[PDB]
Amino acid sequence: ARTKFTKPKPKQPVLPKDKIRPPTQLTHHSNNLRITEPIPPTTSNLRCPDDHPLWQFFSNKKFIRSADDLPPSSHIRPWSIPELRHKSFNDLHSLWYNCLREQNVLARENHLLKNIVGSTHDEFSELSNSIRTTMWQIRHVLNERE
Amino acid sequence: SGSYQHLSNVGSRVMKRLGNRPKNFLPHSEKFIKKSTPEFMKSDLKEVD
Amino acid sequence: KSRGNTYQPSTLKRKRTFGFLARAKSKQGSKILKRRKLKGRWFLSH
Amino acid sequence: SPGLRWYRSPIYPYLYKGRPVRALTVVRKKHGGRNNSGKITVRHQGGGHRNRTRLIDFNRWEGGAQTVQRIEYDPGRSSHIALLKHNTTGELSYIIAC
Amino acid sequence: AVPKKKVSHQKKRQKLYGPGKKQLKMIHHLNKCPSCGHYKRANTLCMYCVGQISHIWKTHTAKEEIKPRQEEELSELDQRVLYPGRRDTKYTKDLKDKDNYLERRVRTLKKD
Amino acid sequence: MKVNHSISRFRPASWFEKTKIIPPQVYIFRNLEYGQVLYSQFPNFSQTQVDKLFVRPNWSNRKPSLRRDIWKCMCVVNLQNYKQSVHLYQNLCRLRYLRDVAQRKESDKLRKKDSNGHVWYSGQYRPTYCQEAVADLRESLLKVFENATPAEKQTVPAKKPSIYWEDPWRMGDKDKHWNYDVFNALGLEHKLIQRVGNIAREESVILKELAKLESHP
Amino acid sequence: DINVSEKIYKWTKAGIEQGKEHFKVGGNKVYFPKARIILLRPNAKHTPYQAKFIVPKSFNKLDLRDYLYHIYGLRAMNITTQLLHGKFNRMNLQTTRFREPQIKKMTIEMEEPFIWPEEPRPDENSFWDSTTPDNMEKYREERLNCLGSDANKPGTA
Amino acid sequence: LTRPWKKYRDGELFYGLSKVGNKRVPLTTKQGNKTMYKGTRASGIGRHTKFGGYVIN
RNA sequence: AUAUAUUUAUUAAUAUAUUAUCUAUAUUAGUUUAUAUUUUAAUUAUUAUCAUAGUAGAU
RNA sequence: UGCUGACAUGAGUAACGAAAAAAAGGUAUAAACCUUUUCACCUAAAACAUAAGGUUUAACUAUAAAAGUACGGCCCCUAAUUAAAUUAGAAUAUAAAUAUAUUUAAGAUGGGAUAAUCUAUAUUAAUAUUUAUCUUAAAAUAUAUAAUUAUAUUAUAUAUUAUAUAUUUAUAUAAUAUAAACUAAUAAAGAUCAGGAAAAUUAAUGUAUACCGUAAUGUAGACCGACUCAGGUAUGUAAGUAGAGAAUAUGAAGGUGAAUUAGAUAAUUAAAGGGAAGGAACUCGGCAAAGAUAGCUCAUAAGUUAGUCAAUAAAGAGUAAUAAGAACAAAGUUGUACAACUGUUUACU
Ligand SMILES: [Mg+2]
Ligand SMILES: [Mg+2]
Ligand SMILES: [Mg+2]
Ligand SMILES: [Mg+2]
Ligand SMILES: [Mg+2]
Ligand SMILES: [Mg+2]
Ligand SMILES: [Mg+2]
Ligand SMILES: [Mg+2]
Ligand SMILES: [Mg+2]
Ligand SMILES: [Mg+2]
Ligand SMILES: [Mg+2]
Ligand SMILES: [Mg+2]
Ligand SMILES: [Mg+2]
Ligand SMILES: [Mg+2]
Ligand SMILES: [Mg+2]
Ligand SMILES: [Mg+2]
Ligand SMILES: [Mg+2]
Ligand SMILES: [Mg+2]
Ligand SMILES: [Mg+2]
Ligand SMILES: [Mg+2]
Ligand SMILES: [Mg+2]
Ligand SMILES: [Mg+2]
Ligand SMILES: [Mg+2]
Ligand SMILES: [Mg+2]
Ligand SMILES: [Mg+2]
Ligand SMILES: [Mg+2]
Ligand SMILES: [Mg+2]
Ligand SMILES: [Mg+2]
Ligand SMILES: [Mg+2]
Ligand SMILES: [Mg+2]
Ligand SMILES: [Mg+2]
Ligand SMILES: [Mg+2]
Ligand SMILES: [Mg+2]
Ligand SMILES: [Mg+2]
Ligand SMILES: [Mg+2]
Ligand SMILES: [Mg+2]
Ligand SMILES: [Mg+2]
Ligand SMILES: [Mg+2]
Ligand SMILES: [Mg+2]
């Protein structure tokens, strides 16, 4: 403990002048730098292709479709088992993937609708359900064919 | 309404219990549903299953 | 010293001693599960 | 200290201060006086310093001449043990030292 | 200690409303604010007028807001791609809803 | 044992010309979780660099961690001399120090804020740090080039400096910024890191190829 | 002579140059997958060269790469997985509590940039208006929580 | 004051609605000691290595 | 070092005003200091807080 | 002292749970929220980074980013231990259940290659508990005139100068440069209390690198305690000044200043400071309070079981202190009864 009888410590040793090695760096930063305003990244520097494969997740490059843009339920019907019975394997395969792509688009729209705006319109949901009906009909047809 | 509930089927037991309410207690839920909706939204007929 | 803090949580011990396997892998634990099923309990074991 | 007043132990300056031959030892498992039911069957037996049991020979079947390389303290018993080396084959062994 | 019998309606009511020190007092010491003929408390200032002067002080001494140049000259598309939206939790939603837990002072009556 | 590595100390131009492990260049990395920026003389970094650059952290400018997934290369600046590379690194570190300790009040003066007066954030991600890093790089490059400008053919015309960006969108306006006489006279170009492979995972390979290209211009 | 990381890099370069996959295709063929992926709005921490998806929980990083490439032609240069937690919820205090779903999300690095389309104005599209849902819920809670004399208090919905 | 709109003690918790509840719900990836690994049926692809790595089949 | 005003066909001395007395290298691995090198990076008068009212002599 | 439900009295009483706060502005909305400044408090923490746990409580739904070289898990290997598993008709025993012994499988709190000059795990060719770092060595310096001691050094950690390259990759190295702590790798060596288990090399091909954890809280309002409870709760860093020290004082950065506020400060209660003359006269009892004239270097008695046990002896000396003028460590002798001694006990008299 530091009593009052304490005796000050000496300063630790210093190497003489003629023995001190000079530093490897002799110059340093500029003593004139000033704080400048940040520069935001600008989108003008980008050439986004209009045919980018991410547009396939949108219909007509629309953020979210309107009731007018959606296909009316009256004019739409899912595929029938007999109509899929006489479609070649390539045709069924292609229809499957078209159905899946449309379902992906509907899925993103429905997620934005039920997560952000939280509405209960349930239109995209039934449309995707119709597509799913066609899909399992295709599966049935392929199994029965084999 | 951020829930993610539209992506998974969780709590199947509870959901089935709520969706299969006994028919003799239906007025209990009918009352709250009716009194919790506006006049221009509601109808004077009994919802059916 | 003070009492009341007898439950010291640890998922490892909780599952090993009160888990579903900890009961389904024995005669007695199987009987516990069967009895709870018969009573109609929703949750048989941790 | 009061605990050193009645501490006496014989000292044998010829004993070997190093470790034993690992190939002639096995880890000694501690039971605590408890049997296969987990209940204390022999009381007053419990925790202590970690130990290894030494595979010492009680049969001496082989035969031939063997030279004693060193004498060691074996914590698992009260007598010292003697490390042997066979003159013709050189295999190492442990026996009770006389 | 502990009460030994339930106290009667009479005793409770006379103990509470009986004595005059426990009774609220009619506020006689009201008068007319010279700056506006409305009611105010005697030997007290008028809150409407005090707040009006403070509002004048605020409008005339408010420090200019700080609007960084790089942000004020930033396009809407870049603003959208750099600073997108977010969802506010229930706590911040309620906190932002301020008119349900803060009251402004109410004007007094015109003394005639 | 050989405890000390190249990334351990601060390496000057004498060391760089004795070893010639990399051409004259400075690496700038972005943190994918906090948005912060880290400067290095080498394609890699260790805890010492983080300690040097984040000296006084707070609830806003938290001290980042050395989990290699959140650190990604923002840009690679290729200079004409090891002297200039060291000069630029020192300038960047000095200006970071000024921005976070000595002149924090004016840095805050310039930063963006949201309601409640906090620097705009999404999670613990604050975009302003990358923008500040780009501005500091511009300023440091300007000082570095202003220091020396031979503008003559002493022995060889010498190569022209470059900035290899991760993405053209990061740098701001190419006319309102990066359009000064010093840069034009030196012939500084703004190139892009090739995206023909997994950039994040094969970062080291890409940077090593870039270094070879710069070493042999 | 060449490190395996360098060999992987040349593999990916060769794939892109030849137009084939920039990866090694597996042998477990799936002709009719019924997996669905959900594109998501960019966050402040992403760049125009990144895209994030909500993908099946049982999905895989290689699976996302292959799915994107063969079904859409999109080449994901680097994929990264973010599996979210499920918070406890209960639709009412008198019901068993149960955890919310755990959603899986992956970020992909792309070659060419992408920016989403603009938000629609309230009057343009009927589905994109939060006033009616939010007002309905506010009326819901007000009517469910009006106990006594608040029934005559004018509503704000 | 945790919530500026509640100046007096009324029963509301620091967070959430109820402090108690059922604990016999199934576990998931986020719960358990560091040793706990449940998985998401997303990788039966290859073989683990004797050292710790993983080789894709 | 900034800002307003001039002594020639950025700017020197004044009127002052504002801000700062830092950083960065070496001395065998890390932290501290100590001294060299780099930089404008200072040595006198008052004041305050904390140590039981920090402490002792009065009032 | 029936059971359930509703409502009363105590009563608008007690309480609001260790705490520093004040203006201006957001807002003529605010003690309680946000911002700025002033002031304080914790600072070998009330900070930073983590483990376990948990109603995601977070800077949130547009949400916690991994081929590995400081990434954990996963996987290989096993300890303690576990197992409706395992063993010529026949493993042994047993009212059933079942219990033994052996195999096998499982099981960390443990072990597991390479890697910044960056690195490569797969298939086919053979089958070292715990503890310590010398009296003595060599040069040059302070050294005295033969001293001898006084020390980097009697052992390691790297960067510069020179003697050289295969069109400057590995070396042979002679010089220059450390004050005190601490770290991981050597070498030698001390006591007895004698100190884990387990999975084997070159070749030729080969690698497109799966899955899960990652927010915030974590001497706590985010876990265990019926509560936003002064309790319980595992690690590492923990500025500088000062010290033997992680004691004690301060506090640079950081964080914070609290679901109670403003007045007033009666009797009285709690925690704290001072006190004339006297000094245990109090009380069952010096209970409580007060009392320290170095903390370093000296010196230190009778007894004695010979152990500076007594001993940190008491009293005392040296070092600036002479009216005093931080916190902390240090609180006197002696007889007797009982018990050799250190230790254990009635979680809560
Ligand atoms: Mg309990
Ligand atoms: Mg147990
Ligand atoms: Mg005995
Ligand atoms: Mg990598
Ligand atoms: Mg992951
Ligand atoms: Mg709790
Ligand atoms: Mg956990
Ligand atoms: Mg203090
Ligand atoms: Mg004080
Ligand atoms: Mg009373
Ligand atoms: Mg009273
Ligand atoms: Mg009171
Ligand atoms: Mg106010
Ligand atoms: Mg302390
Ligand atoms: Mg300290
Ligand atoms: Mg913390
Ligand atoms: Mg790993
Ligand atoms: Mg095993
Ligand atoms: Mg382990
Ligand atoms: Mg964590
Ligand atoms: Mg963290
Ligand atoms: Mg209790
Ligand atoms: Mg507490
Ligand atoms: Mg202290
Ligand atoms: Mg401070
Ligand atoms: Mg804190
Ligand atoms: Mg309080
Ligand atoms: Mg008082
Ligand atoms: Mg007195
Ligand atoms: Mg006196
Ligand atoms: Mg007496
Ligand atoms: Mg008396
Ligand atoms: Mg006493
Ligand atoms: Mg004497
Ligand atoms: Mg004597
Ligand atoms: Mg004491
Ligand atoms: Mg005793
Ligand atoms: Mg004792
Ligand atoms: Mg007791």
For F78, list phi and psi in degrees, rounded to 5: -110, 120
CA distance F125 to F188: 31
Sign of the CA dihedral with F126 first, then F33, F163, and A50 last:
negative
* A27 CB and strand I closer than 7 A: yes
Calculate the alpha carbon distances from F98 to E68, F47, F53, F103 in Å. 20, 21, 11, 5
Q: Please say whether the beta carbons of D42 and D82 come within 8 A.
A: no
Q: Please say whether the beta carbons of D11 and D41 come within 8 A.
A: no
Task: Give me the helices (H) in chain C, please.
Answer: 11-18, 20-24, 27-39
- For residue A106, which of A71, A76, A68 has the smallest C-alpha distance? A71
Decide: residue E24, CB within 10 A, 0-12 exposed, 13-18 middle, 19+ buried. Answer: exposed
Contact F205 G44 (CB under 8 A): no
* Crossing angle between the packed helical segments A124-145 and A89-112, to the nearest 10 degrees: 160
Other CB atoms within a 10 A radius of the CB of residue F82 amount to 21
* A31 CB and strand I closer than 7 A: yes
- For residue F59, which of F136, F103, F133, F121 has the smallest C-alpha distance? F121
Decide: residue E76, CB within 10 A, 0-12 exposed, 13-18 middle, 19+ buried. Answer: exposed
Grouping H, G, I as helix, E, B as strand and the rest as coil, residue F85 is helix
Edge-to-edge order in the sheet of strand F162-165: F37-40, F25-31, F71-78, F162-165, F189-192
- For residue G96, which of F106, H18, F196 has the smallest C-alpha distance? H18
Residues 29-48 of F with CB under 7 A from strand I: 48
The DSSP H or E segment spanning A142 is helix A124-145
Calculate the alpha carbon distances from A107 to E73, G53, G84, G120 in Å. 37, 11, 19, 18
Sign of the CA dihedral with G31 first, then G35, G38, and G39 last:
negative
- For residue F134, which of G48, A32, A41 has the smallest C-alpha distance? A41
Task: Let me know the angle formed at the C-alpha of H28 by H23 and H34, rounded to the nearest 5 degrees.
Answer: 100
Other CB atoms within a 10 A radius of the CB of residue G140 amount to 15
Identify the residue whose tokens are 């149960």. G98
The DSSP H or E segment spanning A94 is helix A89-112
Tokens of G78: 């680097």
Grouping H, G, I as helix, E, B as strand and the rest as coil, residue D6 is coil
CA distance D74 to F217: 75
Say which DSSP state F8 is in.
T
Say which DSSP state G85 is in.
P
CA distance A119 to G133: 6
Decide: residue A99, CB within 10 A, 0-12 exposed, 13-18 middle, 19+ buried. Answer: buried
Q: Please say whether the beta carbons of F134 and F170 come within 8 A.
A: yes
Identify the residue whose tokens are 């109410």. E106
User: C-alpha A69: how far from its chain's center?
Assistant: 25
* Gap from H16 CA to J57 C1', Å: 7
Q: Please say whether the beta carbons of A43 and E77 come within 8 A.
A: yes
Say which nucleotide is closest to residue A11, CA to C1' distance. Answer: I34
Calculate the alpha carbon distances from B23 to B27, G6, G33, G92 in Å. 9, 70, 41, 21
Q: Please say whether the beta carbons of A70 and G129 come within 8 A.
A: no
CA distance F34 to F55: 16
> For residue G83, how many C-alpha atoms fall within 13 Å in the half-sphere facing its CB?
13
CA distance G122 to G129: 6
Say which DSSP state C6 is in.
-
Task: To the nearest 10°, report the CA torsion of C37, C38, C40, C46.
Answer: -30
CA distance G5 to G9: 6
Tokens of B27: 């007025």
Edge-to-edge order in the sheet of strand D81-86: D66-72, D81-86, D92-96
Residues 6+ apart with CB under 8 A from A128: A102, A103, A106, A107, A110
CA distance G137 to B32: 14
The amino acid occupying position D28 is: R
CA distance E69 to A37: 8
CA distance E32 to G122: 52
Ligand 18 mean position, distance from CA H49 (Å): 14
Tokens of F134: 């780009």
Calculate the alpha carbon distances from H49 to D39, F124, F151, G4, H52 in Å. 43, 37, 60, 18, 5
Strand duo F189-192 + F162-165: pairing: parallel
Sign of the CA dihedral with H14 first, then H17, H20, and H21 last:
negative
For C38, list phi and psi in degrees, rounded to 5: -60, -45
* Gap from G121 CA to J273 C1', Å: 74
Q: Which of G31, G40, G127 sits opposite A121 (nearest CB)?
A: G127
* Gap from G148 CA to J8 C1', Å: 22
CA distance E75 to E82: 10
Decide: residue A43, CB within 10 A, 0-12 exposed, 13-18 middle, 19+ buried. Answer: middle
CA distance A26 to F92: 18
Contact of C7 with chain H, judged by CB distance below 8 Å, is answered with no
Say which DSSP state A114 is in.
I
Identify the residue whose tokens are 């909780």. C14
Q: Please say whether the beta carbons of A108 and A57 come within 8 A.
A: yes
Task: Give me the helices (H) in F98-170, please.
Answer: 104-110, 128-147
CA distance F216 to F210: 10
Q: Please say whether the beta carbons of E40 and E49 come within 8 A.
A: no
Resolution (angstroms) stands at: 3.0
Task: To the nearest 10°, report the CA torsion of G4, G7, G9, G12.
Answer: -130
Tokens of B9: 């089927």
Q: Return positions of chain J under 7 A from a protein CB.
A: 8-12, 16, 25-30, 32-36, 48-76, 80-84, 97-101, 108-109, 112-114, 116-123, 128, 156-161, 168-169, 176-180, 185, 190-197, 207-216, 221-228, 231-232, 242-245, 247-248, 253-256, 258-259, 294-295, 305-306, 319-320, 326-329, 340-342, 347-348
Tokens of F155: 């022995």
The DSSP H or E segment spanning F162 is strand F162-165
Asked how this structure was determined, the answer is: cryo-EM
Residues 6+ apart with CB under 8 A from G156: G138, G142
For F164, list phi and psi in degrees, rounded to 5: -95, 110
Using the CB atoms, write b or e for A1-28: b if 16+ within 10 Å: eeeeeeeeeeeeeeeeeeeeeeeeeeee
Grouping H, G, I as helix, E, B as strand and the rest as coil, residue D98 is coil
The amino acid occupying position G132 is: T
DSSP assignment of B1-49, as one string? Answer: ----GGG----HHHHHHHHT--GGGHHHHHHHHHHTS-TTT--SS----
Q: Please say whether the beta carbons of G111 and G12 come within 8 A.
A: no
Contact of E82 with chain A, judged by CB distance below 8 Å, is answered with yes
Three state DSSP letters for chain E: CCCCCCCCHHHHHHHHHCCCCCCCCCCCCEEECCCCCEEEECCCCCHHHHHHHHHHHHHHHCCCCCCCHHHHCCCHHHHHHHCCCCCCCHHHHHHHCCCCCCCCCCCCCECC
E23 labeled part of a ligand binding site: no
Residues 6+ apart with CB under 8 A from F60: F118, F119, F121, F126
Chains G/H: 3 or more C-beta pairs closer than 8 A?
A: yes
CA distance F199 to F201: 6
First to last CA, chain E: 56
Q: Please say whether the beta carbons of F166 and F73 come within 8 A.
A: yes
Sign of the CA dihedral with A44 first, then A50, A56, and A60 last:
positive
Q: Please say whether the beta carbons of F88 and F77 come within 8 A.
A: yes
* Gap from F142 CA to J276 C1', Å: 83
DSSP assignment of A9-71, as one string? Answer: PPPPP---GGGPPPPS------TT----------GGG----TT-GGGGGSBTTBSS--TTTSP
The amino acid occupying position C27 is: K
Grouping H, G, I as helix, E, B as strand and the rest as coil, residue F194 is coil
The amino acid occupying position G9 is: Y
Contact of E83 with chain G, judged by CB distance below 8 Å, is answered with yes
- Residues from chain E that touch F112, judged by Cβ atoms under 8 A, are 68, 71
Say which DSSP state F69 is in.
T
E59 labeled part of a ligand binding site: no
